């Protein structure tokens, strides 16, 4: 694409500069260019890809929620015309485009070349996340299939992570956190969400004794997010 003429290493360097400057759209464009070079990504590069797109889509999701709230109130109210719906639809279409872009990178060809557990689980978690973001805005006849695509990606990631990673591994923990959120607020399964968060937390607790001080800090940080959700949900 527009990054085809830039060296892979320069794209990575510029993605890191864009992160420092809080230019997340640029960051994502640089990392998309890096992925499209066709080589596998290192751990650090996968993290840069994730940070970039999660910030871009996070801004879109927050804006969509503001606009959706205004639209819902308008349908309680004076007729103000089509503008609120039109603008919510504009933001929604942009958000869906970003999700489709990330899913396209995962399908062409990040997932199929990812053989180590850490990379494969990471990419499958990402796939579940971006289908989950599509599900947040889906209202039509494909909503069930979008939800099932998220579930299927998360489930494959969970199966690999349980077999190949320790219960304190940060990717395993972040995956479980996000799949639990999927259950709670996408799949209408709050009991499954709570069970998954509690079991994940307790199994990580029992494995903390094996860790260095730095790994302990990494794992306990995510465990606290699981606890935050359990406190909110119970």
């Amino acid at each position: 694409g527009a990054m085809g003429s830039m060296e892979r290493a320069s794209l990575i360097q510029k993605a890191k500069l864009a992160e420092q400057a809080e230019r997340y759209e640029d960051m994502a464009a640089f990392m998309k260019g890096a992925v499209e070079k066709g080589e596998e990504l290192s751990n650090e590069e996968r993290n840069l890809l994730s940070v970039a797109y999660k910030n871009v889509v996070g801004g879109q999701r927050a804006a969509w929620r503001v606009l959706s709230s205004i639209e819902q109130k308008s349908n309680e109210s004076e007729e103000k015309g089509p503008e609120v719906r039109e603008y919510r639809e504009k933001v929604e279409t942009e958000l869906q485009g970003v999700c489709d872009t990330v899913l396209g990178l995962l399908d062409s060809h990040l997932i199929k070349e990812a053989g180590d557990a850490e990379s494969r689980v990471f990419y499958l978690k990402m796939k579940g996340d971006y289908y989950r973001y599509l599900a947040e805005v889906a209202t039509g006849d494909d909503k069930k299939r979008i939800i099932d695509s998220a579930r299927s990606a998360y489930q494959e990631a969970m199966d690999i992570s349980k077999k190949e990673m320790p219960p304190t591994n940060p990717i395993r923990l972040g995956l479980a956190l996000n799949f639990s959120v999927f259950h709670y607020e996408i799949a209408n399964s709050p009991e499954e969400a709570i069970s998954l968060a509690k079991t994940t937390f307790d199994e990580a607790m029992a494995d903390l004794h094996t860790l260095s001080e730095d790994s302990y800090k990494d794992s306990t940080l995510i465990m606290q997010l699981l606890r935050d959700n359990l406190t909110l949900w119970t």
């Binding site: 996340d129 956190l177 996000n178 959120v181 997010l225 909110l232 949900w233």
Partner: peptide, 8 residues
Amino acid sequence: RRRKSCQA
């Protein structure tokens, strides 16, 4: 209080 997903 919004539920947590994996961010930073």
